[PDB]
Write a protein that binds this DNA or RNA. Structure first.
Lengths: 129, 65, 123, 80, 82, 205, 100, 150
RNA sequence: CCCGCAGAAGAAGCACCGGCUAACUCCGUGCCAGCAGCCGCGGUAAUACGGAGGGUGCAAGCGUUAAUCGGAAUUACUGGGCGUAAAGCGCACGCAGGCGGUUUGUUAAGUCAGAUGUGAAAUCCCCGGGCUCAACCUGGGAACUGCAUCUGAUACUGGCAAG
């Protein structure tokens, strides 16, 4: 009973960046393409793409600087087992702001950097560093 | 050899003090370029900078003040 | 250790209660001695250690090591139980207070004068 | 508007009166989970219209017996 | 009686009479309605040892709040300027 | 509330000058300072980390004549104060009135400073102060009262205070027995060897 | 409208008043339509040699793009003022805002 | 110049036909004082020789750490074997706080203010290099800009 | 509180010194007498027992006991684990309950933003003020991380409808 597609795909990043494969794939949903665009904007994934109409799949490709993978510590925070909700000013700074926390806020999804300057919190998704 | 022909320095800054501690002997005298190997391009503007830093008393004239 | 399991039943730590039931955790109690004993210690040590069995005014009856060089405590005397556990002698977890009430201080002691109930000599 | 609140009717056989489940979806103070917690609210109505299977809107009113401190003002989805 | 009276919040031999709107039936230093000012009989030369709140105490005495003899003397003392 | 015992035992345990004497005699001539006092002073320390931190704390306490509860309160105040707590502790220690009297040299030792403060003999901003631990604010004028003025004690104190380093944060007036605490000193002025971070570590444990 | 570099010492006993002088210099230069390129205060750094007795003067840096006459009035202020000692002014080729 | 400091010396033993033979083991850490550390563990039949081998091995396989002026750049946990390590950058008005085993390896690095706590196993031999893990992958914003693009 | 008389004159004890833990030597005792918070000391050369000398730490207080938190991430929400250290029910179905693929529209419960009321005073913190200083007293602020109301956002979850 696959009950967390987001956790599934984040583990697709972890396994791909461990086995240094160029691309990973998973099924598609709007939360996935949104967080894929956020990773694109912050430079952890250099291409993501949506294919198919009867059964939409997502293919993402992976970044490697000196052979080792670019993303090094990615962890889901708010789970079906336990939900985390954070107000505007208690939003964390991942690795003292060096990494990022991606959050689902009330006006849309963005990183902690954009959310804290727009002055709104929300359902925090995960930490990426 | 010349340290200042490396690093691409445009001019020796007189407020850079730790480098001048290396190029001033313990008396307070300016060392010759014949020992350091500094190019005479940079030795002149260097010794000017010690004379500037000395005026601000960041560098002693002698050890008997 | 899953959050639903802990909502069903929170974390439970044992109290790990006190080593001495001197009762209501009082720092001292007074008691009437049941009998003076002299008892042998645990295996690595050998001695003839001076112990008292004392009946507290609380009602409890426990053993108390009689500290110091010699003592003049006989039957039915009333002493002060303090606490502190003696590892050579299993079963005793308490000390008497020398120099207090019927118990006399240790005779002619100079260093560690306070803990054995001796007045300061003239000097 | 007036202080009003909404909930599921659970009892049916109650004479000119009714008891309502008031679910609250609150966060756990320690272990953090938003848990389904409900309460029963002992509510007044005239000539006993509503029954089990209903969501009703209630207001705190003056006491009519013990615990009897709500009156319903509106009934919606009156179907199984 | 809603009134305005004194509470010795200072120390031994060093009083500090916090003047307060209190019900008269309460203790001097216990329950009250709300603080209004302070008096210091042992104040320093810089005259900060006495302060009130004029319009609030006017509102209370218009509401019907009585006052005690000492705070009557002190409202006579502050007057308007001196 | 003060040590009032032998001072060169303390200096001989610390191994360095604790400034507990006037200075009219050589310290090596007064006591054989190189090893600790007592029978077993001559041996090697091989001193532990807690030992060296303890020794630094004992050193600063025996320089300033402060007992443990007071100096603990000084730590609590220093950690309370903003900035580097390590030199904040020394800033509080330098604010002492007897420390001021010694720093202006009205006493040959800080014990003379303490006695002179306790014997109602310093006028501060027109107010006499009996308190030795009186914290001195900046821009404060201290003075010696007419009683004990031109006494041989303070004359010899000035004449042996002329040989010191003349601290920058005080203004001295030796003809009028007047002085000014103009600024609190900084760490750069004071002896360059107080290892305050060791005290910070020992009290942080 | 040329680039100048000013470093000036302050007598240690007037250390508390130095940001007022700094603001007053910046106010004058902005009134004369000059600008500030770097301003930083060095604290009371220890001298290599005592000057008029003393030690540990208060060092101030400034980089100013300015017409000449207002700077000239500024050195006259340094000469007239006794709370300032040992001033020095400089030409530099372009504007500079760096560290140290 | 690279700030050699001993951490802990231990006596280990070996059993033979004759009986026990004891041997001395010494742990030390060296490093200049700015982004340069290296630990050493050396054993010998005598103590001074043991420190000599340990420090000579310490002047070898040094490792580089990306610092700020005097502190770490972000929180990091360091996990090795059974030891766990947690460490934070601290304010400039704070000193450096850690266990005695971590104080040497952090002090020779050149940090002056780190909030550091050891969890679990606190043997010195694993606590050091439980600290070198974490410091080996301290990361700088310029380097992650090289990683990502900004 | 201020002034005057006389003369160092009227005023220092307590614990500790094997490691942990700062401070070590001599004598007596010799598995005795005893110490001891844990490891452990003592059976004729005891730095651990008792005495002395010396030293160390506190100080008009000093020790012991007592109690609670911490160190203890040793009930681990933050923040623990279950092959062999303690730990996967012998194995299945299974009601309640916890969670759940994917889109559209609706709602706005959770969630988030703003506003209001309130969160007594005192206590804590910070900037001040006065007791010769300090403790203490005290002005103002900050906080009181809360609750409740109302207005908004609908990304996600929850609800509903349609797939």
């Amino acid at each position: 009973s696959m009950q967390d597609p987001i956790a599934d795909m984040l583990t697709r990043i972890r396994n791909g960046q461990a086995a240094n494969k160029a691309a990973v794939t998973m099924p598609s949903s709007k939360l996935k393409v949104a967080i894929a665009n956020v990773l694109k904007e912050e430079g952890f994934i250099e291409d993501f793409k949506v294919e198919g109409d009867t059964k939409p799949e997502l293919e993402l490709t992976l970044k490697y600087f000196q052979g080792k993978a670019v993303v090094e510590s990615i962890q889901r925070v708010s789970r079906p087992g336990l939900r985390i909700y954070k107000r505007k000013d208690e939003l964390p700074k991942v690795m003292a702001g060096l990494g990022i926390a991606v959050v689902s806020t009330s006006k849309g999804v963005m990183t902690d950097r954009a959310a804290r300057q727009a002055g709104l919190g929300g359902e925090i998704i995960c930490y990426v560093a | 050899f010349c340290r200042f022909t490396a690093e691409g320095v445009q001019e020796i800054d007189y407020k850079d003090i730790a480098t001048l501690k290396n190029y001033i002997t313990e008396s307070g005298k300016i060392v010759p370029s014949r020992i350091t190997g500094t190019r005479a391009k940079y030795q002149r503007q260097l010794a000017r900078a010690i004379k500037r830093a000395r005026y601000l008393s960041l560098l002693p004239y002698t050890d008997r003040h | 250790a899953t959050v639903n399991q802990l909502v069903r039943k929170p974390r439970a730590r044992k109290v790990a209660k006190s080593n001495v039931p001197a009762l209501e955790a009082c720092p001292q109690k007074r008691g009437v001695c049941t009998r003076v004993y002299t008892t042998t210690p645990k295996k690595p040590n050998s001695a003839l250690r001076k112990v008292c069995r004392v009946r507290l005014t609380n009602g409890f009856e426990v053993t108390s090591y009689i500290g110091g060089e010699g003592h003049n405590l006989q039957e039915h005397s009333v002493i002060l139980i303090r606490g502190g556990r003696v590892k050579d002698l299993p079963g005793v977890r308490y000390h008497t207070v020398r120099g207090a009430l019927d118990c006399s201080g240790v005779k002619d002691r100079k260093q560690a004068r306070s803990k054995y109930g001796v007045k300061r000599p003239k000097a | 508007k007036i202080r009003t609140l909404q909930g599921r009717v659970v009892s049916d056989k109650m004479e000119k009166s009714i008891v309502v489940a008031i679910e609250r979806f609150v966060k756990h103070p320690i272990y953090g989970k938003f848990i389904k917690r409900t309460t029963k609210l002992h509510v007044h109505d005239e000539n006993n219209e509503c029954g089990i299977g209903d969501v009703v809107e209630i207001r705190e009113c003056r006491p009519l017996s013990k615990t009897k401190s709500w009156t319903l003002v509106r009934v919606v989805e009156k179907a199984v | 009686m809603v009134t305005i009276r004194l509470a010795r919040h200072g120390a031994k031999k060093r009083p500090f009479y916090q003047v307060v709107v209190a019900d008269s039936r309460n203790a001097r230093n216990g329950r009250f309605i709300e603080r209004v000012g302070f008096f210091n009989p042992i104040a320093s030369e810089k005259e900060e040892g006495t302060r009130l709140d004029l319009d609030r105490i006017a509102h209370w005495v218009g509401q019907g709040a009585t006052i005690s003899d000492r705070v009557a003397a002190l409202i006579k003392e502050v007057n308007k300027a001196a | 509330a003060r040590y009032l015992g032998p001072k060169l035992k303390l200096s001989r345990r610390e191994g360095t000058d604790l400034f507990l004497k006037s200075g009219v005699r050589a310290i090596d001539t007064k006591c054989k300072i190189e090893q600790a006092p007592g029978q077993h002073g001559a041996r090697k320390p091989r001193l532990s980390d807690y030992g060296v931190q303890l020794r630094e704390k004992q050193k600063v306490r025996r320089i300033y004549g402060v007992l443990e509860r007071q100096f603990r309160n000084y730590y609590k105040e220093a950690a309370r104060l903003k900035g580097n707590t390590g030199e904040n502790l020394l800033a509080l220690l330098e604010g002492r009135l007897d420390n001021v009297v010694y720093r202006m040299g009205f006493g040959a030792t800080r014990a003379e400073a303490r006695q002179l403060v306790s014997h109602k003999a310093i006028m501060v901003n027109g107010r006499v102060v009996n308190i030795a631990s009186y914290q001195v604010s900046p821009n404060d004028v201290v003075s010696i009262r007419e009683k004990a003025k031109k006494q041989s004690r303070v004359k010899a104190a000035l004449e042996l205070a002329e040989q010191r380093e003349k601290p920058t944060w005080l203004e001295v007036d030796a003809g009028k027995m007047e002085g000014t605490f103009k600024r609190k000193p900084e760490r750069s002025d004071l002896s360059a060897d107080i290892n305050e971070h060791l005290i910070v570590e020992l009290y942080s444990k | 409208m040329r680039h100048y570099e000013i470093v000036f010492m302050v007598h240690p006993d007037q250390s508390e008043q130095v940001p007022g002088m700094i603001e007053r210099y910046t106010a004058a230069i902005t009134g004369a339509e000059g600008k500030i390129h770097r301003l930083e205060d060095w604290g009371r750094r220890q001298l290599a040699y005592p000057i008029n007795k003393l030690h540990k003067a208060h060092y101030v840096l400034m980089n100013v793009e300015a017409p000449q006459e207002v700077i000239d009035e500024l050195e006259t202020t340094f000469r007239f003022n006794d709370a300032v000692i040992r001033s020095m002014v400089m030409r530099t080729k372009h504007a500079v805002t760096e560290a140290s | 110049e690279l700030q050699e400091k001993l951490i802990a010396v231990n006596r280990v033993s070996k059993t033979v036909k004759g009986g026990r033979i004891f041997s001395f083991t010494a742990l030390t850490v060296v490093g200049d004082g700015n982004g340069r550390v290296g630990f050493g563990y050396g054993k010998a039949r005598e103590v001074p020789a043991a420190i000599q081998k340990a420090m000579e091995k310490a002047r070898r396989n040094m490792i580089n750490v990306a610092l700020n002026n005097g502190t770490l750049q972000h929180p990091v946990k360091g996990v090795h074997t059974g030891s766990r390590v947690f460490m934070q950058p601290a304010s400039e008005g704070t000193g450096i706080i850690a266990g005695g085993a971590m104080r040497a390896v952090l002090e020779v690095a050149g940090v002056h203010n780190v909030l550091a706590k050891a969890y679990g196993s606190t043997n010195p031999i694993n606590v050091v290099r439980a600290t070198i893990d974490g410091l080996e992958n301290m990361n700088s914003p310029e380097m992650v800009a090289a990683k990502r693009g900004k």
